[PDB]
């Protein structure tokens, strides 16, 4: 039971993208938490955990095919100061991930492999959901205003429910 | 208030080492999982989560001191086939970590900073206990034999109270 | 709403393989259970029940497409004394099922049918997982040796 | 200890018959359910599970005496369209089963084997009860009428108050 | 209501065999317990309790038949050092027991008495199960290796927490 | 009242003996813990607590008679690197304790005292159980093999009272 | 750790006598239950189980001393048809047991042994209590009359 | 990874001092309990158990660095008759303990070690608290007297309510 190297390198590209996304999201969460924007921090922490789940399932599938999960390679990681630029950066990361996912899914589906294809649509569906959320947030801040929108998410105490 | 760049770079080096430890321990746990090893997998995943707690407290502390943590870079990650070699790799990475931590702790205890010293001493105690566990496991396996030792890890029981 | 003959024949072949597999799994499980190897018996009988559920889904689907199930025939069943030969036989059965199912899934998706495609992908996933387990266990026993693997793993709780 | 070959081959024949019965009953359960006749489907599923238990205990007994249980060979399996023909088919199956059971028990009873005689008695009682049920239902459908009978065994409700 | 003298002698012989089985099993259980082996000790203690239950039912049945049970006679008792002698002697006593049971059941069913016969085949089935267990453990220890196998029954690894 | 010097000196000697036993057993348990062997450590810890209780009750008994318990002096405590020699050392100190206790209890029963003779009896019984367990353990480890036996203790404890 | 021949042989003799007593008690219990004297049957079953536990502790002690217990040889057992003779057999076996027990306890206490001495002390106490019960029951049965006592002990409350 | 000698005999001597302390405290508690002074006995028993925990953790640390614990040697153990001499003996023992612990903690803090220093301030804090308690007890006994203090501590062990 073995596979051709093209599917393995597709999966490894996706894995490295997921690790970089994890690091970027966690850095964003910590920075915006130090700023004082709490709800964004919680939401991006949840997103980070989701990305770890994706990385875990990808690792499982690649180790199934008797591959070598490479952890050394990383992509370019970028950070921002205001919410607009970090949202934009996450948007481009998601765009690159989804484009790579579509290309890999077509190429590998043409090879008569199925299960990796399944984990691929799972990943692309979650990425599409997150990028839609980010785009909605960007349009919201564009229409509303930076200062007041940042004032929306400030809080000091916690809710009982 | 501000911190001198030296403690910033010590914290950056410690953060890089901790991230490398995360990736190494996690990949190792996964390899033991796939090969059929169960107890060692759980112990390694517990160690990985503890190192992640270390990374969390370190990045919070450095962000407190107007720092700019860097996640792009990583050290060199080592993987092994049988238990002895990645045991040795964990040993050597922990030795490097403890040497660096001792140097850093003395250097900023000499220069008017105590909190980061407390963080490093806590991390040092944790890594000391971990390396003791590794050393006693190594002595056990060299005294008892590889096959007979590995005979007691697989259980295939799955109980529930 | 009538079915397509090659679809029906592919479903029937997969079903017959399922019946042969469940019979083989049950025989082997009983064999090690009489030997005194309880854990293998439990795991193998659980796998047999899983293949039974697979076959039930298969037959419900083939009845849905207005076809006639045939159970009068079944493939050869092979057994063994040591665990190694039976494990190898199970590996061979699962591999042949995987190859046949891949060919069937390709032609069936190409012939504009979707539901049987998703039941087939689920079956492929399950069989791939079982193949993974069998191969890792075979590697483990090859490394440890027969008596050492058999003795210290006996447990009850 | 080791058993005589004749009882071994009697046990193997009974195992084959039990496997065929399991197969046929599962067919009829699924087919009736697809027709839309829920109660008979549930009854037939219960019968199939009982025959599975019978086969399991028989296999355990035959493996006890250091035999070689084989499931490669099967008897003929017949499929019926309406309820009448499949009732008659099950009737013939149970009749041949009880015939073989009586002959085998009388044979082996004289060669100082007792426990397998007892399991043959148990399976004989089970199949006798089942065949009594089948004959009663056949007479009932004959007297009342097929259409009216199956009229009262249908419901598209699936009710569950809680 | 008086039973036949041969019935009484058969019941008495079986009772004597049961008493010998009780004594041997208890002495063994004590020996494995002193050696430190736990699972073997508890299993053979349960076996001895089951044999005592068999003696109970047999003595009730013979007492009902208006007889005088003899609690004086006892067969020979065998003791060895290793597990192999344990299993071999137990297999021997169970084999002679099964032979006596088969002869007794045949003659009892021949001479118009049933309830005693029924408890006869009950004891027969229980003892054949015990023989199967003993034989499979003998095969396992023969194949596995004495020290490697015995490493299993002994274990001090904090079993209290559950 | 006040006791004659013989009983007082024997009790003081016993106190020294159990202090030595407590220290030796605690060090053995700790070293067993460091090498990763789990169950032996907890068993030896329980033995240490038992010896602590023994020392407490003996000190109470001697102080009742307006004596002066001594805690300044000890005996020779010895340490081992492997299992065999620490088992042997425990056996040696145990044999010395048993012989001294027997002599003292005899001579002191000969000089009109029973209550302290009774507590000596209790200590004798507990120490006898400890030595029997030690001897059984030594025989098992010599028969089975050091490495294979040591494989049986290292892990797989799972204490879960809930 | 090996014990002397005298102590181990005394232990073996006591164990054999006790095993015979267990067998006798069980036999009498079953015959009492057969004829409907249920309360006596319960009492005898309890006494037999107590003797079983005593034999268990005795064989544990003898096996502790690198001994070789024997379950092969037994002493003679006696049976009775009415209460008086079975009670008398019980009392006489108790008397012989306690006499041998006193001799053994004296000898062992002279031969530098304690734990076995204590366990024989306990068994002696319990047999003293049991013989007291047997004697008081025999005297009560004598005074009252057999028929009235049998009428007293009957249950007849079998559920079915 | 083992430490130098100076630290190891400092720890071994401290362990011996702890053993002497536990024995002396237990003897004092037993004596006061016999005399009928119950609450004093309870407090002394609690102190002895705490000192035993000290000994256990300290010998655990000794073994940690691949040491050779010695239980053979013992310091002097002194006994008294009234509460005054017992308290004074305890005060002298505690004074020696604090002095030597301070010198040891400084000398090995100056030699790139942290964990042993940490357990040393733990022990030092405990000993400071204990010497405070003994000092205030002696001062109160001096202020009030002898018989009244015993009357305060003494209680009737009725055990019938
Ligand atoms: Fe993703
Ligand atoms: Fe995590
Ligand atoms: Fe650590
Ligand atoms: Fe099944
Ligand atoms: Fe399947
Ligand atoms: Fe049935
Ligand atoms: Fe029993
Ligand atoms: Fe029996
Ligand atoms: Fe002692
Ligand atoms: Fe303690
Ligand atoms: Fe007795
Ligand atoms: Fe202290």
Coordinates of N, CA, C and O in Angstrom, one line a residue, chain C residues 38-142:
Chain C
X38 N -8.6 -14.2 23.9 CA -9.9 -13.5 24.1 C -9.9 -12.2 23.3 O -10.9 -11.9 22.7
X39 N -8.8 -11.4 23.4 CA -8.8 -10.1 22.9 C -9.0 -10.1 21.4 O -9.7 -9.3 20.8
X40 N -8.2 -11.0 20.7 CA -8.4 -11.1 19.3 C -9.8 -11.5 18.9 O -10.3 -11.1 17.9
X41 N -10.4 -12.4 19.7 CA -11.8 -12.8 19.5 C -12.7 -11.7 19.5 O -13.6 -11.5 18.6
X42 N -12.6 -10.8 20.5 CA -13.5 -9.6 20.7 C -13.3 -8.7 19.5 O -14.3 -8.3 18.9
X43 N -12.0 -8.4 19.2 CA -11.8 -7.4 18.1 C -12.3 -8.0 16.7 O -12.9 -7.3 15.9
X44 N -12.0 -9.2 16.5 CA -12.4 -9.9 15.2 C -13.9 -10.0 15.1 O -14.5 -9.8 14.0
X45 N -14.6 -10.3 16.2 CA -16.1 -10.4 16.1 C -16.7 -9.0 16.0 O -17.7 -8.9 15.3
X46 N -16.1 -8.0 16.5 CA -16.6 -6.6 16.3 C -16.4 -6.3 14.8 O -17.3 -5.7 14.2
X47 N -15.3 -6.6 14.2 CA -15.1 -6.4 12.8 C -16.1 -7.1 12.0 O -16.6 -6.6 10.9
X48 N -16.4 -8.4 12.4 CA -17.4 -9.1 11.7 C -18.8 -8.5 11.7 O -19.5 -8.4 10.7
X49 N -19.1 -7.9 12.9 CA -20.4 -7.2 13.0 C -20.4 -6.0 12.1 O -21.4 -5.6 11.5
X50 N -19.2 -5.3 12.0 CA -19.2 -4.1 11.2 C -19.4 -4.5 9.7 O -20.1 -3.8 9.0
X51 N -18.7 -5.6 9.3 CA -18.9 -6.0 7.9 C -20.4 -6.5 7.7 O -20.9 -6.3 6.6
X52 N -21.0 -7.0 8.7 CA -22.4 -7.3 8.6 C -23.3 -6.1 8.4 O -24.2 -6.1 7.5
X53 N -23.0 -5.0 9.1 CA -23.7 -3.8 8.8 C -23.5 -3.3 7.4 O -24.4 -2.8 6.7
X54 N -22.2 -3.4 7.0 CA -21.9 -3.0 5.6 C -22.8 -3.8 4.6 O -23.4 -3.2 3.7
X55 N -22.9 -5.1 4.8 CA -23.7 -5.9 3.9 C -25.1 -5.6 4.0 O -25.8 -5.6 2.9
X56 N -25.6 -5.2 5.2 CA -27.0 -4.8 5.3 C -27.3 -3.6 4.5 O -28.3 -3.4 3.8
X57 N -26.4 -2.6 4.6 CA -26.5 -1.4 3.8 C -26.5 -1.7 2.3 O -27.3 -1.2 1.5
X58 N -25.6 -2.6 1.9 CA -25.5 -3.0 0.5 C -26.8 -3.6 0.0 O -27.3 -3.2 -1.1
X59 N -27.4 -4.5 0.8 CA -28.6 -5.1 0.3 C -29.8 -4.2 0.3 O -30.6 -4.3 -0.6
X60 N -29.9 -3.3 1.3 CA -30.9 -2.3 1.2 C -30.8 -1.4 0.0 O -31.8 -1.1 -0.7
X61 N -29.6 -1.0 -0.4 CA -29.4 -0.2 -1.6 C -29.8 -1.0 -2.8 O -30.4 -0.4 -3.7
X62 N -29.4 -2.2 -2.9 CA -29.7 -3.0 -4.1 C -31.2 -3.3 -4.2 O -31.7 -3.3 -5.4
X63 N -31.9 -3.4 -3.1 CA -33.3 -3.5 -3.2 C -33.9 -2.2 -3.6 O -35.0 -2.2 -4.3
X64 N -33.3 -1.0 -3.2 CA -33.9 0.3 -3.6 C -33.9 0.4 -5.1 O -34.8 1.0 -5.7
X65 N -32.8 0.0 -5.8 CA -32.7 0.2 -7.2 C -33.5 -0.9 -8.0 O -33.2 -1.0 -9.2
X66 N -34.4 -1.5 -7.4 CA -35.3 -2.5 -8.1 C -34.4 -3.7 -8.7 O -34.4 -3.8 -9.9
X67 N -33.7 -4.4 -7.8 CA -33.0 -5.5 -8.2 C -33.2 -6.7 -7.4 O -33.9 -6.6 -6.3
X68 N -32.7 -7.9 -7.8 CA -32.9 -9.1 -7.1 C -31.6 -9.5 -6.4 O -30.6 -9.9 -7.1
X69 N -31.5 -9.5 -5.1 CA -30.3 -10.0 -4.4 C -30.2 -11.5 -4.6 O -31.2 -12.2 -4.6
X70 N -28.9 -11.9 -4.7 CA -28.6 -13.4 -4.8 C -27.6 -13.7 -3.7 O -26.5 -13.1 -3.7
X71 N -27.9 -14.6 -2.9 CA -27.0 -15.0 -1.8 C -26.6 -16.5 -2.0 O -25.9 -17.0 -1.1
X72 N -27.0 -17.2 -3.0 CA -26.8 -18.6 -3.2 C -25.4 -19.0 -3.3 O -25.0 -20.1 -3.0
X73 N -24.5 -18.0 -3.7 CA -23.1 -18.3 -4.0 C -22.3 -17.4 -3.1 O -22.7 -16.4 -2.6
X74 N -21.0 -17.9 -2.9 CA -20.1 -17.2 -2.1 C -18.7 -17.7 -2.4 O -18.5 -18.8 -2.8
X75 N -17.7 -16.8 -2.3 CA -16.3 -17.1 -2.7 C -15.7 -18.1 -1.8 O -16.3 -18.6 -0.8
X76 N -14.5 -18.5 -2.1 CA -13.8 -19.5 -1.3 C -13.4 -18.9 0.1 O -13.1 -17.7 0.2
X77 N -13.4 -19.7 1.1 CA -13.0 -19.3 2.5 C -11.8 -20.1 2.8 O -11.8 -21.3 2.7
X78 N -10.8 -19.4 3.3 CA -9.5 -20.0 3.7 C -9.2 -19.7 5.1 O -9.4 -18.6 5.6
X79 N -8.7 -20.7 5.9 CA -8.4 -20.5 7.3 C -6.9 -20.9 7.5 O -6.2 -21.2 6.6
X80 N -6.5 -20.8 8.8 CA -5.1 -21.1 9.1 C -5.0 -21.4 10.6 O -5.9 -21.2 11.4
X81 N -3.8 -22.0 11.0 CA -3.6 -22.3 12.4 C -2.9 -21.2 13.1 O -3.3 -20.8 14.1
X82 N -1.7 -20.8 12.6 CA -1.0 -19.7 13.2 C -1.7 -18.4 12.8 O -2.3 -18.3 11.7
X83 N -1.5 -17.4 13.6 CA -2.1 -16.1 13.3 C -1.6 -15.4 12.0 O -2.3 -14.7 11.4
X84 N -0.3 -15.7 11.7 CA 0.3 -15.1 10.6 C -0.4 -15.4 9.2 O -0.7 -14.5 8.5
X85 N -0.7 -16.7 9.0 CA -1.3 -17.0 7.7 C -2.7 -16.5 7.6 O -3.1 -16.0 6.5
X86 N -3.5 -16.5 8.7 CA -4.9 -16.0 8.6 C -4.8 -14.5 8.4 O -5.6 -13.9 7.7
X87 N -3.9 -13.8 9.1 CA -3.7 -12.3 8.9 C -3.4 -12.0 7.5 O -3.9 -11.1 6.9
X88 N -2.5 -12.8 6.9 CA -2.1 -12.6 5.4 C -3.3 -12.8 4.5 O -3.6 -12.1 3.6
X89 N -4.1 -13.9 4.8 CA -5.3 -14.1 4.1 C -6.3 -13.0 4.1 O -6.9 -12.6 3.1
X90 N -6.5 -12.4 5.3 CA -7.4 -11.3 5.5 C -6.9 -10.1 4.7 O -7.6 -9.4 4.1
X91 N -5.5 -9.9 4.7 CA -4.9 -8.8 4.0 C -5.2 -9.0 2.5 O -5.6 -8.0 1.8
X92 N -5.1 -10.2 2.0 CA -5.3 -10.4 0.6 C -6.8 -10.2 0.2 O -7.1 -9.6 -0.8
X93 N -7.7 -10.6 1.1 CA -9.1 -10.4 0.8 C -9.5 -8.9 0.8 O -10.2 -8.4 -0.1
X94 N -8.9 -8.2 1.7 CA -9.2 -6.7 1.8 C -8.6 -6.0 0.6 O -9.2 -5.1 0.0
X95 N -7.4 -6.4 0.2 CA -6.8 -5.8 -1.0 C -7.6 -6.1 -2.3 O -7.8 -5.1 -3.1
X96 N -8.0 -7.3 -2.5 CA -8.8 -7.6 -3.7 C -10.1 -6.8 -3.6 O -10.6 -6.3 -4.7
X97 N -10.8 -6.7 -2.5 CA -12.0 -5.9 -2.3 C -11.7 -4.5 -2.7 O -12.5 -3.8 -3.3
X98 N -10.6 -3.9 -2.2 CA -10.3 -2.5 -2.5 C -10.1 -2.3 -4.0 O -10.6 -1.3 -4.5
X99 N -9.4 -3.1 -4.6 CA -9.1 -3.0 -6.1 C -10.5 -3.0 -6.8 O -10.8 -2.2 -7.7
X100 N -11.3 -4.1 -6.5 CA -12.6 -4.2 -7.2 C -13.4 -3.0 -7.0 O -14.1 -2.5 -7.9
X101 N -13.5 -2.5 -5.7 CA -14.3 -1.4 -5.4 C -13.9 -0.1 -6.1 O -14.7 0.7 -6.4
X102 N -12.5 0.1 -6.2 CA -12.0 1.2 -6.9 C -12.5 1.2 -8.4 O -12.9 2.2 -8.9
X103 N -12.3 0.0 -9.0 CA -12.8 0.0 -10.4 C -14.3 0.2 -10.5 O -14.7 1.0 -11.4
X104 N -15.0 -0.4 -9.6 CA -16.5 -0.1 -9.6 C -16.9 1.3 -9.4 O -17.8 1.8 -10.0
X105 N -16.2 2.0 -8.4 CA -16.5 3.3 -8.1 C -16.2 4.2 -9.3 O -17.0 5.1 -9.6
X106 N -15.1 4.0 -10.0 CA -14.8 4.8 -11.2 C -15.8 4.6 -12.3 O -16.4 5.6 -12.7
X107 N -16.2 3.4 -12.7 CA -17.1 3.2 -13.7 C -18.5 3.7 -13.3 O -19.2 4.3 -14.1
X108 N -18.8 3.6 -12.0 CA -20.2 3.9 -11.6 C -20.4 5.4 -11.5 O -21.4 5.9 -11.8
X109 N -19.3 6.1 -11.0 CA -19.4 7.6 -11.1 C -19.4 8.1 -12.5 O -20.1 9.0 -12.9
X110 N -18.7 7.4 -13.4 CA -18.7 7.8 -14.8 C -20.1 7.5 -15.5 O -20.4 8.1 -16.5
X111 N -20.9 6.6 -14.9 CA -22.2 6.3 -15.4 C -23.3 7.0 -14.6 O -24.4 6.4 -14.4
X112 N -23.1 8.2 -14.2 CA -24.1 9.1 -13.7 C -24.9 8.5 -12.6 O -26.2 8.5 -12.6
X113 N -24.3 7.9 -11.6 CA -24.9 7.5 -10.4 C -24.1 8.0 -9.2 O -22.9 7.9 -9.2
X114 N -24.8 8.4 -8.1 CA -24.2 9.1 -7.0 C -24.3 8.4 -5.7 O -23.3 8.4 -4.9
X115 N -25.5 7.9 -5.4 CA -25.7 7.3 -4.0 C -24.8 6.1 -3.8 O -24.2 6.0 -2.8
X116 N -24.8 5.2 -4.8 CA -23.9 4.0 -4.7 C -22.5 4.5 -4.6 O -21.6 3.8 -4.0
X117 N -22.2 5.6 -5.2 CA -20.8 6.2 -5.1 C -20.4 6.5 -3.7 O -19.3 6.2 -3.2
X118 N -21.3 7.1 -2.9 CA -21.0 7.5 -1.5 C -21.0 6.3 -0.6 O -20.2 6.2 0.3
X119 N -21.9 5.3 -0.8 CA -21.8 4.1 0.0 C -20.5 3.4 -0.3 O -19.8 2.9 0.6
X120 N -20.0 3.4 -1.6 CA -18.7 2.8 -1.9 C -17.6 3.5 -1.3 O -16.6 2.9 -0.8
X121 N -17.6 4.9 -1.2 CA -16.5 5.6 -0.6 C -16.4 5.3 0.9 O -15.3 5.1 1.4
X122 N -17.6 5.2 1.6 CA -17.6 4.8 3.0 C -17.0 3.4 3.2 O -16.2 3.2 4.1
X123 N -17.4 2.5 2.3 CA -16.8 1.1 2.4 C -15.3 1.1 2.2 O -14.5 0.4 2.9
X124 N -14.8 1.9 1.2 CA -13.4 2.0 1.0 C -12.7 2.6 2.2 O -11.6 2.1 2.6
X125 N -13.2 3.6 2.8 CA -12.6 4.1 4.0 C -12.5 3.1 5.1 O -11.4 2.9 5.7
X126 N -13.6 2.4 5.4 CA -13.5 1.3 6.4 C -12.5 0.3 6.1 O -11.7 -0.2 7.0
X127 N -12.5 -0.2 4.9 CA -11.6 -1.3 4.5 C -10.1 -0.8 4.6 O -9.2 -1.6 5.0
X128 N -9.9 0.4 4.2 CA -8.5 1.0 4.3 C -8.1 1.0 5.7 O -6.9 0.7 6.1
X129 N -9.0 1.4 6.6 CA -8.6 1.5 8.1 C -8.3 0.1 8.6 O -7.3 -0.1 9.3
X130 N -9.1 -0.9 8.2 CA -8.8 -2.3 8.6 C -7.5 -2.8 8.1 O -6.8 -3.5 8.8
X131 N -7.2 -2.5 6.8 CA -5.9 -2.9 6.2 C -4.8 -2.3 7.0 O -3.8 -2.9 7.3
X132 N -4.9 -1.0 7.4 CA -3.9 -0.3 8.2 C -3.7 -1.1 9.5 O -2.5 -1.4 9.8
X133 N -4.8 -1.4 10.2 CA -4.6 -2.2 11.4 C -3.9 -3.5 11.2 O -3.0 -3.9 12.0
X134 N -4.3 -4.3 10.2 CA -3.8 -5.6 10.0 C -2.3 -5.5 9.7 O -1.5 -6.3 10.2
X135 N -1.9 -4.6 8.8 CA -0.5 -4.4 8.5 C 0.4 -4.0 9.7 O 1.5 -4.6 9.9
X136 N -0.1 -3.1 10.5 CA 0.7 -2.7 11.7 C 0.8 -3.8 12.7 O 1.9 -4.1 13.3
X137 N -0.3 -4.6 12.9 CA -0.2 -5.7 13.8 C 0.7 -6.8 13.3 O 1.4 -7.4 14.1
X138 N 0.7 -7.0 12.0 CA 1.7 -8.0 11.4 C 3.1 -7.6 11.6 O 4.0 -8.4 11.9
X139 N 3.4 -6.3 11.4 CA 4.7 -5.8 11.7 C 5.1 -6.0 13.1 O 6.2 -6.4 13.4
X140 N 4.2 -5.7 14.0 CA 4.4 -5.8 15.4 C 4.8 -7.3 15.8 O 5.7 -7.5 16.5
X141 N 4.0 -8.2 15.3 CA 4.2 -9.6 15.7 C 5.5 -10.1 15.0 O 6.2 -10.9 15.6
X142 N 5.8 -9.7 13.8 CA 7.1 -10.0 13.2 C 8.2 -9.5 14.0 O 9.2 -10.3 14.2

